[PDB]
Design an enzyme around this catalytic site. Structure first.
Site, PDB file in Angstrom:
ATOM      1  CG  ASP C  48      25.643 -19.822 -76.003  1.00 59.86           C
ATOM      2  OD1 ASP C  48      25.467 -18.707 -76.577  1.00 59.86           O
ATOM      3  OD2 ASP C  48      26.336 -20.320 -75.058  1.00 59.86           O
ATOM      4  CB  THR C  81      29.010 -17.620 -74.575  1.00 61.56           C
ATOM      5  OG1 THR C  81      27.881 -18.377 -76.056  1.00 61.56           O
ATOM      6  CG2 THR C  81      27.934 -17.320 -73.795  1.00 61.56           C
ATOM      7  CB  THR C  82      28.714 -17.590 -79.816  1.00 58.27           C
ATOM      8  OG1 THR C  82      29.055 -17.485 -81.395  1.00 58.27           O
ATOM      9  CG2 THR C  82      27.805 -16.537 -79.777  1.00 58.27           C
ATOM     10  CG  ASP C 382      20.871 -19.000 -72.841  1.00 58.13           C
ATOM     11  OD1 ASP C 382      20.681 -19.163 -71.620  1.00 58.13           O
ATOM     12  OD2 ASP C 382      21.365 -19.734 -73.813  1.00 58.13           O
TER      13      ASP C 382
END
Lengths: 103, 513, 514
Positions: C48, C81-82, C382
């Site tokens: 991530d 996020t990435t 997630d």
């Protein structure tokens, strides 16, 4: 400064230019009196004195009177004036104020 | 030995060019400058024109060889755009660079270009309007073509004289002026200036009170090889077969001088009838004092030192035939200048050959005491002469100051080259080199090449408005009203000389030393 | 010394690329996992953006800066996020390209703001409501796990994902703060994630024949000591003098033996019937004869549980934190429709289930028992964090960068500011959009552009959201593909995107100070 201030090349050049155009316009306005004689040594000497002031530390009045004589009295008018109206034989001896105008 | 390959050879290419190019970008529009040029000779040269800077010296790279090539194109094929032509390619290169910075083939991005150039060529036809070759219509082109090339105030006084020169035509319609260029550089109280003086002007003429300064009716025997030999189209010895024969010719050499004036004094009355018509021998070498006087005394004007060009333009101007001898000639071939007028300006005589029976040859009198001033003013003239000659040869005219480029970059609105988008990128790449004139100026001039051009773009996206960065202050306007109008000869060719060399480097993956 | 003017910028944005680069596929079905033996030095495995950030030791200040602001959106999203890392550098370059062209970063920052809102404004335009159903729950859970793990492991978990979130909608809770109780099973096989609508404890303690299968569940979850320290203590540790530490322990086992008798009637009061199952759960140890005699009462008893467990069992089972073994109310002591002590591997894992509250709900992953088992864990959590957003908003939108082009199609063409000065930042702003779909596709397949024009043209045709097919590297409509962003994530991203990319764009200097 205007380079540090960041003003471009022709910009400030146009600044001095139109102003040196503006200045050349004022230069006849800032003419203060006048004088001349196609003959007289003394009156003409003073300008010829004061022009060579910058160009001479030496006798101001003496080279004033000679070149005034010289420039004038080589001529029937000196209403005309030319490139060589005066030449020099550089000669030592006696004084430097022993200098004489011989046409 | 060694080589370079892949993008390594490419990087050297694309970097060297855009490393040299932006150096040239210092100058364009009037808000450009005059770049100091010192070649191996040591002379300073200040030029906003490309051909001078490009063909004199260069920071040596493999790209520096091709840049003068397409620079040998623009000035040759047009003469306006030499300043403008350079700034286009690297702006396009950095664009394409992005795509190969992304990574892509220089071949596929090659194929993304020329169509856009071909498009803009179409678009250039589209946006422009054909305009009058009228003198004052040319002015707005004249100033600009000059002014894009050279600084305004010089171009401004050039705007008058250059048009006066390119309108001087007999309707010989050219991209350039070959004959309309006769340049007389004169040491003068004016350091930068050009005087338009009609008719062929002779390198000199000889003084003498009996020698007519004014010849309205001229029977011109063109005269080269001097008085000192009999019937000679070249000066050479009739003697010197031994050591003491060296003395004999010069003893008999004064004879031919009187023989030669004898020819000219009779050849006048032969051809001219009485002495009222000035018989013109323009003696392209020095006239010997006796015959200098005796031709004067007979009414012949013996003119000292014309030019080989003033001999050939004479063959043009006077409608008569030249000669390399002073010999008696049949009255037919003798040239007729409707005015042969020796003109002493400063100390130097410039003999007008006027009422040119072919007034394709006029003369410009260049002014300066200082050659660095006298060279530069000479330089601004002729690149703008052919530039403004591209105004009066062109019934089509393209409006300048970025009016036509926003009519391309926006009207190039993409997915028209939708296929791979590489053209859609390549046209985008090409679209981004279009605005360098709106860029370099708002760059050079006030504000931003960007923040002003966005208005230009916008204000063109507004109402389809012809709009552009000022040549002067770099702010938006309507470029059609301003009159800034580029030569129709420039635009098309201005594009070609770019994308053709912009095509080469892409296909060049290799360099070896 | 200091770094000023452009130097306060370049090093920041130059660092923001290779950072952006390595994880360019941490993301989407094209996503690729990374390890660390480097940052924390251990044997570590992670996929991530924000999570691979913190694990490394990042000495470049900017690398630490996004980790903060990314963590905010990382919380709810867990993906993206990435993603958000990628568009910011994609933005920073264009702004840099302007300052490379030369320009003022604050008027450039000023150029983002309308465009951001315009895109935000566009974000409610492009948000399309797919309300919460397992399909949208599947396709968002998988596309998150397709991002975080195999599409295989995505659909393997996508069952377990929707498993717990059914009861959190029974909670009507748009977020999951429980049912996120996860048990990680010792096994050879990663993929096995077991739904238990109650909890699981690894316990059932030290004793069998306690009726480890409890049909009527009556749960005492206690910290009372049926076992405790044998260690020498006076003040709580080894005292300077030896002997005074001794007097404490002789009251331990006696206290424990007594509580055994207390549980007897605590079995009799509560039940009186072994047929009514009773469960003890101790937060501490339990002596054998306790469990042994507690096995005599028809009681299974679990020593050494955890605080979540106690509470989760207090919740899920309707259980207790109650502190005593004395006779207590059965109605206090919670209930589960079924209880069993299950064994895979060495330890006996109690499956407590059909609990009064289906509130704390075990998704039990088996696994290699590795950083891999640790790896497969973090993603599905997630995967939820994706679908909770889908549960959050009513608007779930095609993923794989479907929204990105249409914004660049929306934004740039007409100037959203109708003004170049901002359009500068806008032209910078709307380029940031495109990287993730076009970088993953070109990583996964055909390029940015030739793929863009396909996603562009179809957007240019429809304006409908054609995403990317990352199974190829070509565009498809990410509606049918199932890769589905919610509005929440894409909403959240520009906020986390812009505000961090702005203030750092406006750094006027950087200095080592003290």
């Amino acid at each position: 400064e205007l380079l540090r201030i960041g003003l471009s090349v022709s910009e400030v050049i146009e600044g001095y230019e139109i102003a040196c155009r503006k200045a050349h316009e004022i230069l006849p306005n800032l003419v203060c009196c006048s004088a001349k004689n196609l003959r007289d040594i003394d009156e003409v000497s003073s300008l010829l004195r004061t022009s060579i002031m910058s160009k001479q530390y030496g006798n101001e009045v003496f080279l004033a009177k000679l070149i005034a004589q010289a420039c004038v009295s080589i001529f029937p008018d000196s209403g005309h004036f030319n490139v060589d109206n005066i030449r020099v034989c550089k000669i030592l001896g006696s004084g430097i104020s022993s200098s004489s105008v011989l046409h | 030995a060694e080589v370079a390959r892949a993008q390594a050879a490419l990087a050297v290419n694309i970097s060297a060019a855009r490393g040299l190019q932006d150096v040239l970008r210092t100058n364009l529009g009037p808000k450009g400058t005059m770049k100091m040029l010192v070649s191996g000779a040591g002379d300073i040269k200040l030029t906003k024109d490309g051909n001078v800077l490009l063909h004199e010296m260069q920071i040596q790279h493999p790209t520096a060889s091709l840049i003068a090539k397409v620079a040998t194109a623009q000035d040759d094929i047009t003469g306006d755009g030499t300043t403008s032509n350079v700034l286009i390619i690297g702006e396009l290169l950095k664009q394409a660079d992005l795509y190969i910075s992304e990574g892509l083939h220089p071949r596929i991005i090659t194929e993304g270009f020329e169509a856009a150039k071909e498009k803009a060529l179409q678009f250039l036809e589209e946006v422009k309007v054909s305009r009058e070759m009228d003198r004052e219509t040319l002015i707005d082109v004249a100033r600009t073509s000059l002014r894009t090339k050279v600084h305004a105030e010089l171009a401004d006084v050039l705007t008058e004289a250059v048009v006066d020169s390119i309108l001087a035509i007999k309707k010989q319609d050219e991209p350039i002026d070959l004959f309309m260029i006769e340049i007389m550089e004169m040491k003068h109280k004016s350091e930068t200036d050009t005087s338009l003086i009609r008719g062929l002007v002779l390198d000199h003429g000889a003084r003498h009170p009996d020698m007519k300064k004014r010849v309205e009716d001229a029977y011109i025997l063109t005269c080269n090889v001097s008085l000192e030999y009999e019937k000679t189209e070249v000066n050479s010895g009739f003697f010197y077969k031994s050591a003491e024969e060296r003395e004999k010719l010069v003893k008999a050499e004064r004879k031919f001088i009187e023989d030669r004036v004898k020819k000219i004094i009779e050849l006048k009355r032969k051809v001219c009838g009485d002495s009222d018509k000035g018989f013109v021998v323009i003696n392209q070498k020095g006239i010997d004092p006796f015959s200098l006087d005796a031709l004067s005394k007979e009414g012949i004007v013996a003119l000292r030192r014309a030019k080989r060009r003033n001999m050939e333009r004479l063959t043009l101007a006077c409608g008569g035939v030249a000669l390399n001898s002073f010999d008696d000639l049949s009255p037919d071939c003798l040239g007729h200048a409707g005015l042969v007028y020796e003109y002493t300006l400063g100390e130097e005589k410039f003999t007008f050959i006027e009422k040119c029976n072919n007034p394709r040859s006029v003369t410009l009198l260049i002014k300066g005491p200082n050659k660095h001033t006298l060279t530069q003013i000479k330089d601004a003239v002729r690149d703008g002469l052919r530039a403004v000659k591209n105004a009066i040869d062109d019934g089509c005219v393209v409006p300048g100051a970025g009016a036509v480029e926003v009519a391309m970059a926006e009207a190039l609105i993409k997915h028209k080259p939708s296929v791979k988008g590489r053209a859609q990128l390549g046209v985008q790449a090409f679209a981004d080199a279009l605005l360098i004139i709106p860029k370099v100026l708002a760059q050079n001039s006030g504000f931003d090449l960007q923040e002003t051009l966005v208005k230009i773009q916008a204000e063109h996206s507004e109402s389809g408005q012809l709009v552009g960065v000022d040549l002067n202050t770099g702010e938006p306007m309507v470029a059609a009203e301003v009159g800034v109008w580029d030569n129709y000869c420039v635009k098309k060719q201005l594009l070609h000389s770019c994308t053709v060399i912009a095509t080469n480097i892409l296909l060049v993956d290799e360099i070896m030393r």
